[PDB]
Nucleic acid binder design. Structure first.
Ligand SMILES: [Mg+2]
Ligand SMILES: [Mg+2]
Ligand SMILES: [Mg+2]
Ligand SMILES: [Mg+2]
Ligand SMILES: [Mg+2]
Ligand SMILES: [Mg+2]
Ligand SMILES: [Mg+2]
Ligand SMILES: [Mg+2]
Ligand SMILES: [Mg+2]
Ligand SMILES: [Mg+2]
Ligand SMILES: [Mg+2]
Ligand SMILES: [Mg+2]
Ligand SMILES: [Mg+2]
Ligand SMILES: [Mg+2]
Ligand SMILES: [Mg+2]
Ligand SMILES: [Mg+2]
Ligand SMILES: [Mg+2]
Ligand SMILES: [Mg+2]
Ligand SMILES: [Mg+2]
Ligand SMILES: [Mg+2]
Ligand SMILES: [Mg+2]
Ligand SMILES: [Mg+2]
Ligand SMILES: [Mg+2]
Ligand SMILES: [Mg+2]
Ligand SMILES: [Mg+2]
Ligand SMILES: [Zn+2]
Lengths: 50, 85, 71, 119, 52
RNA sequence: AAACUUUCAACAACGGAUCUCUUGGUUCUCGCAUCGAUGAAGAACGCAGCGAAAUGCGAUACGUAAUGUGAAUUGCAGAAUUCCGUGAAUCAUCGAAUCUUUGAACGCACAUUGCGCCCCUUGGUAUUCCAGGGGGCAUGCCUGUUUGAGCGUCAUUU
RNA sequence: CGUGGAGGUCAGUGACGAAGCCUAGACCGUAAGGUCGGGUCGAACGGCCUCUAGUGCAGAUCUUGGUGGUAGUAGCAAAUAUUCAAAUGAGAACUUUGAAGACUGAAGUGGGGAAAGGUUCCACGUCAACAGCAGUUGGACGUGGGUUAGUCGAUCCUAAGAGAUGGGGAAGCUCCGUUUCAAAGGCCUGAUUUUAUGCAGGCCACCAUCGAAAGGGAAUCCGGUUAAGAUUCCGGAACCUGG
RNA sequence: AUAUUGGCGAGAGACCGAUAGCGAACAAGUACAGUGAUGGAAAGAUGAAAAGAACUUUGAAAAGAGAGUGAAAAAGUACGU
């Protein structure tokens, strides 16, 4: 949809920011259990339903 | 071919985002949220949907104002400020 | 953006979403006492408002660039 | 470093506004360097100074208006007590202890005496 | 707890599909869909004669 | 006779049972009574030197002010004068403030960041046009003020 | 006979190895089972007298999880089809360049769009997984860059319709109804120029709002320009609305 | 004087012990499917301390063989048993 509403574009931007792997230095912190960004999204595997 | 060949035709959205719930359940041709019943005054919730109520009841949000009520009650709603002993 | 400056006499700024062309115009005019020709805006895909500003011939974008402090 | 509230309390409005604009200017000038320099923690002190200065301004203003309405009723809807809803809507002790003439007379006549049973 | 193993909406698939007649959870696409519940033998189902 | 098949044993495999742990859960008892038009519960979007989440926060944005404690935080660099001190801390406490866009949601609407109106102020040679800033404009209801309407009706005029 | 827990007792056992696990090694009982030696391991456990129970598995097309024989088998065969040399690389049928042979044949395998998709676009590095073979390649992975309007659209009007207010039903969430049984207003003109604006006038009956990215509608073209943007930028030349 | 699976603050158990116990001992009402009402998971444990394997050698590289820390690498981030 080339003609899209501002709210949709806002969601677009947020998703684009969220799509990212871990800032690696997290894995060094004390008592860290995080391993990978389990909530990553990909445009071929899981549609947004918005 | 009522199955797979038909499934190719579905490209017109019926529900979109609710200004209140933000769940994409706003049936447009009726102008009504399914989850919130947005245009209506009160929230749309029912007693049989236990999990439904549990997914939205109080305490699952930020409680931007309710969190400090207990603190204020404990301290008796004092006014003024400390005294710098 | 750097190319734009020394070629088009253009400055590039990121501006708060609530701003509008009038507000950018007046703000630049008083922040840098430069005379502005026109303002041209858009929203980048990351949700920030990018504004190109074109200054009249009486001023040099490059000359004020290093004065602002980035070059 | 940064500014300290206790000596900021002493200055007057004009000095405050001038200081605030100086701090904003310094913030922008430091921000522009930040994008080229890989890392630059001096943001924190500047922004906290902004916060402190604005807070001092706000206290000064509200104190002034509080004095201006001091000692007379009907002061604005957000300077009085934000206790609750119910507490605001309940009776104040003045009327809560209001009693009819008949009741007051009867209580004065026959108060509950204080007695004991040993002998 | 009284509500043990019942906070769901399962039901039987009935015969004819070469599976057990245990009631099973609906839905789909989440790994939990299709397993059993409500049974003393089901994983995560209620116990026998819940202690009162 | 080998290979092949089968059984058992040692070692190496696949798999995570068993054993032992537990900041969790479950039930019982005791005490307390505190949400919201001064804008609640809830939602969206944003905020960090280096962040995706959880947690915290609202353009004063992992926070400001106030009090107490009295030397840190930590994954890396930085800050150190703040160390016999109106003073570190993602500390504790918490009475002062900010509180984006929303939300019963309140100028009119909303699949839009749409369209109004009033007051004060600033510039554009301006009461009328354009623009910037600040403050305003819901409904039902109660008491009161002010202005009204009806041959419903009273008196008084010529 | 055995199991999870409880009261008592053996001043019970143990980092000089408790619990568990393996052992065609041993002993005891008809059995349920118990006991020992050897290896492995690393932190608690047992006997006896009593108490209590969510207490003993082969099955239930049982439930969850795991793994086989089948088997390196079925198979990987529509859309006419590929070939030579060089370059790159450890590696080349599958990457690039050149050379050749081909097809789509303008109701195209071409050039743009609407619904939807949401960074796939473009650049740099890179191949653990994905592209049911390969892979130096990619719509994959990692780090970044990129979308510019007075004139293109939305917003503006109304259609089929939806829907407040005045009102009337219903115990009630709420239902009807759209100019309806309503006291449903703003408009010009001047006046005063203390002065904001009532005080002078006259006018007018309909009477909210939403509802089209293909209906109605004010206005822009040409050349050039990037890795990616253009009727949006640059250059030149115009037009509309409001004052 | 009585009720109370909600809220807030406390105290306990002949309760369960990671397929049990709330569904959730973890970034759980999250990941995920459905237009929607709704449906809804899996996943706890190296070691006292990272001391998380310097250096050599074969390999394009992943890796391997040595060397080394550790009481143990029959603990090597595919980490107790
Ligand atoms: Mg259709
Ligand atoms: Mg439809
Ligand atoms: Mg634009
Ligand atoms: Mg054996
Ligand atoms: Mg042993
Ligand atoms: Mg141990
Ligand atoms: Mg049983
Ligand atoms: Mg069995
Ligand atoms: Mg049997
Ligand atoms: Mg079976
Ligand atoms: Mg064959
Ligand atoms: Mg074959
Ligand atoms: Mg075939
Ligand atoms: Mg044609
Ligand atoms: Mg195209
Ligand atoms: Mg393959
Ligand atoms: Mg391969
Ligand atoms: Mg591409
Ligand atoms: Mg209606
Ligand atoms: Mg319209
Ligand atoms: Mg034209
Ligand atoms: Mg293009
Ligand atoms: Mg031009
Ligand atoms: Mg060992
Ligand atoms: Mg071990
Ligand atoms: Zn909703």
């Amino acid at each position: 949809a080339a003609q899209k509403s501002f709210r949709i574009k806002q969601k677009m931007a947020k998703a684009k920011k969220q799509n990212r792997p871990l800032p690696q230095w997290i894995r060094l912190r004390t008592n860290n259990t995080i391993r990978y960004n389990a909530k990553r999204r990909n445009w071929r595997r899981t549609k947004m339903n918005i | 071919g009522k199955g797979t060949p038909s499934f190719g035709k579905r490209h017109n959205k019926s529900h979109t985002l609710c200004n209140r719930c933000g769940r994409r359940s706003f049936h447009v041709q009726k102008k009504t949220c399914s989850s919130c019943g947005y245009p209506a005054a009160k929230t749309r919730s029912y007693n049989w949907g236990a999990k439904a109520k549990r997914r939205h009841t109080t305490g699952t949000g930020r409680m931007r104002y309710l969190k400090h009520v207990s603190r204020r009650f404990k301290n008796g709603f004092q006014t003024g400020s400390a005294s710098k002993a | 953006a750097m190319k734009k400056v020394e070629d088009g006499n253009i400055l590039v700024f990121q501006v708060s979403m609530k701003a509008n062309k009038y507000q950018i115009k007046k703000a630049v005019k008083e922040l840098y006492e430069v005379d502005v020709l026109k303002v041209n805006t858009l929203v980048r895909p990351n949700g920030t408002k990018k504004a190109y500003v074109r200054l009249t011939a009486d001023y040099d974008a490059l000359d004020i660039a290093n004065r602002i402090g980035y070059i | 470093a940064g500014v300290k509230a206790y000596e900021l309390r002493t200055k007057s409005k004009e000095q405050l506004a001038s200081q605030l604009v100086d701090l904003k200017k310094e913030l922008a000038e430091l921000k522009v360097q930040k994008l080229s320099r890989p890392s630059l923690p001096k943001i924190k002190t500047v922004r906290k100074s902004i916060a402190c200065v604005l807070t001092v301004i706000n206290e000064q203003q509200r104190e002034a208006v509080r004095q201006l309405y001091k000692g007379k009723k009907y002061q604005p809807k957000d300077l009085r007590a934000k206790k609750t809803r119910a507490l605001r809507r309940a009776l104040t002790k003045f009327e809560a202890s209001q009693v009819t003439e008949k009741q007051r007379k009867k209580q004065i006549a026959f108060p509950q005496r204080k007695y004991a049973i040993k002998a | 707890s009284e509500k043990a193993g019942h906070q769901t909406s399962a039901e039987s698939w009935g015969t004819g599909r070469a599976v057990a007649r245990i009631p099973r959870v609906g839905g789909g696409g989440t790994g939990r869909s299709g397993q059993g519940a409500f049974g003393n033998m089901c994983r995560g189902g209620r116990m026998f004669a819940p202690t009162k």
